[PDB]
Amino acid sequence: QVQLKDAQQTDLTSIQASFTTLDKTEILKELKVTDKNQNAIQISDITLDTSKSLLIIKGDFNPKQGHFNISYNGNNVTTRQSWEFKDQLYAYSGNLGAVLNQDGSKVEASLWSPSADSVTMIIYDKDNQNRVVATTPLVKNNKGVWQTILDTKLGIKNYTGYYYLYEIKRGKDKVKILDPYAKSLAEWDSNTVNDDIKTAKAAFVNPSQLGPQNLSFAKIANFKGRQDAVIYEAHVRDFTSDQSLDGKLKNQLGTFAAFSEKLDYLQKLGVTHIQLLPVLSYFYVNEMDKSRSTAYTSSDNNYNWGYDPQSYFALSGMYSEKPKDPSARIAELKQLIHDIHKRGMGVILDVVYNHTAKTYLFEDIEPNYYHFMNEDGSPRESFGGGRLGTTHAMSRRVLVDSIKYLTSEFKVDGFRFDMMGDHDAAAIELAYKEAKAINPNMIMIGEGWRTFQGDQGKPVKPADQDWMKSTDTVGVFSDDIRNSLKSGFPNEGTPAFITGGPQSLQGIFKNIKAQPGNFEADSPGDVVQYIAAHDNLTLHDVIAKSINKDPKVAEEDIHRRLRLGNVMILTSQGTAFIHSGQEYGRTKRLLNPDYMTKVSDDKLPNKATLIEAVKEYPYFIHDSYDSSDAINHFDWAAATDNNKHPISTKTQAYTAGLITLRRSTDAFRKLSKAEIDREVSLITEVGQGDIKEKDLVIAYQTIDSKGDIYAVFVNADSKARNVLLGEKYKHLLKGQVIVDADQAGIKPISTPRGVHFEKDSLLIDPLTAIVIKVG
Numbered sequence: 001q002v003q004l005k006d007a008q009q010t011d012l013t014s015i016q017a018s019f020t021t022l023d024k025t026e027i028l029k030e031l032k033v034t035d036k037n038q039n040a041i042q043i044s045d046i047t048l049d050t051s052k053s054l055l056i057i058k059g060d061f062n063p064k065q066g067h068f069n070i071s072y073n074g075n076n077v078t079t080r081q082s083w084e085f086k087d088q089l090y091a092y093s094g095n096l097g098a099v100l101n102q103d104g105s106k107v108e109a110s111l112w113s114p115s116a117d118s119v120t121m122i123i124y125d126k127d128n129q130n131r132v133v134a135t136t137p138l139v140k141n142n143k144g145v146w147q148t149i150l151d152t153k154l155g156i157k158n159y160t161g162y163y164y165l166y167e168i169k170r171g172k173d174k175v176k177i178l179d180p181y182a183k184s185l186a187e188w189d190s191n192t193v194n195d196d197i198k199t200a201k202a203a204f205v206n207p208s209q210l211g212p213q214n215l216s217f218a219k220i221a222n223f224k225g226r227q228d229a230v231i232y233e234a235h236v237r238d239f240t241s242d243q244s245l246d247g248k249l250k251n252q253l254g255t256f257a258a259f260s261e262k263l264d265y266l267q268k269l270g271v272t273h274i275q276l277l278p279v280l281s282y283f284y285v286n287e288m289d290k291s292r293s294t295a296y297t298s299s300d301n302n303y304n305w306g307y308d309p310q311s312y313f314a315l316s317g318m319y320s321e322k323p324k325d326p327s328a329r330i331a332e333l334k335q336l337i338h339d340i341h342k343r344g345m346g347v348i349l350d351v352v353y354n355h356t357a358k359t360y361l362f363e364d365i366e367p368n369y370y371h372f373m374n375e376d377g378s379p380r381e382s383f384g385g386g387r388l389g390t391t392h393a394m395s396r397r398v399l400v401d402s403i404k405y406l407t408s409e410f411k412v413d414g415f416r417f418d419m420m421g422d423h424d425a426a427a428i429e430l431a432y433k434e435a436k437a438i439n440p441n442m443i444m445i446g447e448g449w450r451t452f453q454g455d456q457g458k459p460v461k462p463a464d465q466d467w468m469k470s471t472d473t474v475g476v477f478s479d480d481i482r483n484s485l486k487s488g489f490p491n492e493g494t495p496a497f498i499t500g501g502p503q504s505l506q507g508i509f510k511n512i513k514a515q516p517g518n519f520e521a522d523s524p525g526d527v528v529q530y531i532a533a534h535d536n537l538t539l540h541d542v543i544a545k546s547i548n549k550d551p552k553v554a555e556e557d558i559h560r561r562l563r564l565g566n567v568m569i570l571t572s573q574g575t576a577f578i579h580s581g582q583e584y585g586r587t588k589r590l591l592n593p594d595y596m597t598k599v600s601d602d603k604l605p606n607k608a609t610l611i612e613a614v615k616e617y618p619y620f621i622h623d624s625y626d627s628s629d630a631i632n633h634f635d636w637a638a639a640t641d642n643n644k645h646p647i648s649t650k651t652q653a654y655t656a657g658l659i660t661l662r663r664s665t666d667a668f669r670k671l672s673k674a675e676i677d678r679e680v681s682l683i684t685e686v687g688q689g690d691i692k693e694k695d696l697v698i699a700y701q702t703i704d705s706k707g708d709i710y711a712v713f714v715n716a717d718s719k720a721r722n723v724l725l726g727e728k729y730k731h732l733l734k735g736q737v738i739v740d741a742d743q744a745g746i747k748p749i750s751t752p753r754g755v756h757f758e759k760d761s762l763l764i765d766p767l768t769a770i771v772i773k774v775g
């Protein structure tokens, strides 16, 4: 029953051969090894691993005479190079990609592909991307890097704006690939994909020549660390796709250039960093269709969040006014970023190295290497594409080089990693080190969910929530504070602190101190505090679902609860995170006539959540990645029109004032856990007055470096509550109210609403937040 299955070369003198089973003399009989020309190779020794049913074969296996044929009883298999051995032989540290000279007369090009028989560049007309104008063969060096220099010989005087693909030949097969180090691309429409050309085309550009030449990193006032960041998460389309802006907007809707026209709002709002959803090239899109999708739908829209990665260096053409000009988008993003920096803010880019849109994107270039792999060599896959194996040297280069390019070229102030837990901690550490070396004020965050897969049977320390106890570099989202305050996975819509579900106050209090219960944070900067984001139901919609009330009659109550949530996030230690629209009560309700009322299970709308109490239009979208502009647009009237929308504008002014408070004092922005435990204390301890172990009211006190004292009270109960102060906190009765039921800020409120001062206690109205300051 002993039969040879496969084999891999792992170093210069070693080959591992896998068998069906191994249950030494009798096998060094039958086993024979030959080179690429069928010539016999001497076996120095063998070792049997009966547990793994693999045979380790020793000898002199020169890879230049490879690959080797291993044979046993009629089975003949060809050796595959392991990724570790491919790194040993081919790991390259030189320049990759295509570089134009100053006047555009010459391009120096480089592509890494060590297993290729030949590599040919195909060049396409800048003014007609389907028109082939030239082809030229590249030459391979010792590290498997194919190179050429484009010049007058191809009949082209200036290569600027021209497009290119690489045709790689390995034996009988030929395939056309996209330069992974491409700095721009031809206008892209995924409908044009066929069997021959199935990627966008790279473009010849000179990034350094484009955009404002004095582009610099952010200058954020009183920003001394990741704990001082107040991050605002926006999608470039969403932020300016409102029909309300038609006739306002000097630039085209949903572009970098339009986004800049609304930065004053964000400057006033008070956020420090603007986080943009994926601006790098994504696959499922038609960039030549900028039309607004006006019907309320949750599927089959040109709209895309951008989590279908095509390139890690080249920007998407979707947010460019001139997608057919590959230089424009580089200039347009630089200008937006310069406009952000001018207003005292920073920019953070959402980046998606965990997976690609299509496994072939990298697998066509070099097989059995770039992706995390199964033991048979096949690529591990995720979300319809390939899992980038960032423990592998050239895959790690792609991540780190793109982070360095984006940082230094676009002067980016931070990065957010999608599914950071898919990655090894070493790659993200290195990315941080390199980024921080360029930009000393660099900050990084990411989704640290425990999702790691990696290479089969090759465990590695992942960059997830458990990494936080062994690093003070990248911070992770706190799902614990999210869930405890307003629900989330696996139980979205379940009553929680601000939605009528009593929670353990110690757990809430520890979250407020940046000490979540589901992972160890040894520093407050490890924790990104949030209750909403682009994913899942909006804060408004999840509140309405959780309490089961129709916004048509309960708009006011929903916003009272929403404001409590924003108070808690903006007075909690760590890094504060706000979803775009969280400030006004953004909604994703499906206002489609076909879903005026509850429909059958068979005809359910995609990615929608039913709120039973709603009479007309009961479905709300919890995953709007493929939803229309009608669903996804930022509602500017709701955000800024005081007369037409008094409730949402009151909520946004409330949120703006909470941001001012937060930035006004380091009481809410402490550096260490040590000082947090010593200087942030729980007023509502279990047994003080009517406070129970699980409850809906909480109060806490913090002190700043000037020792100024700030006390925050949140009554999330539906009845009034007396909060006991006693001899310990009686000094608070002499303080000034700076946040009440109606307004938030840093100035004393002369006649505060929702609170009454007693002898040694405070009487607080239902669904009311109070903040007192003692100078």
Ligand SMILES: [Ca+2]
Residues within 6 Å of the ligand: 267, 268, 269, 270, 656, 660
């Ligand atoms: Ca302000």
Ligand SMILES: [Ca+2]
Residues within 6 Å of the ligand: 126, 127, 128, 161, 324, 325, 326
């Ligand atoms: Ca063009």
Ligand SMILES: [Ca+2]
Residues within 6 Å of the ligand: 468, 469, 470, 471, 472, 473, 521, 522, 523, 526
């Ligand atoms: Ca830490």
Ligand SMILES: [Ca+2]
Residues within 6 Å of the ligand: 284, 300, 301, 302, 303, 304, 625, 626
């Ligand atoms: Ca879509």
Ligand SMILES: [Cl-]
Residues within 6 Å of the ligand: 317, 320, 321, 322, 323, 324, 325, 326, 327, 328, 329, 330
């Ligand atoms: Cl462009």
Ligand SMILES: [Cl-]
Residues within 6 Å of the ligand: 489, 535
């Ligand atoms: Cl989630």
Ligand SMILES: [Cl-]
Residues within 6 Å of the ligand: 551, 552, 554, 555, 556, 558
């Ligand atoms: Cl509402």
Ligand SMILES: [Cl-]
Residues within 6 Å of the ligand: 532, 533, 538, 539, 540, 579, 580, 581, 582, 585, 586
């Ligand atoms: Cl929201």
Ligand SMILES: [Cl-]
Residues within 6 Å of the ligand: 644, 645, 646, 647, 648
């Ligand atoms: Cl309103």
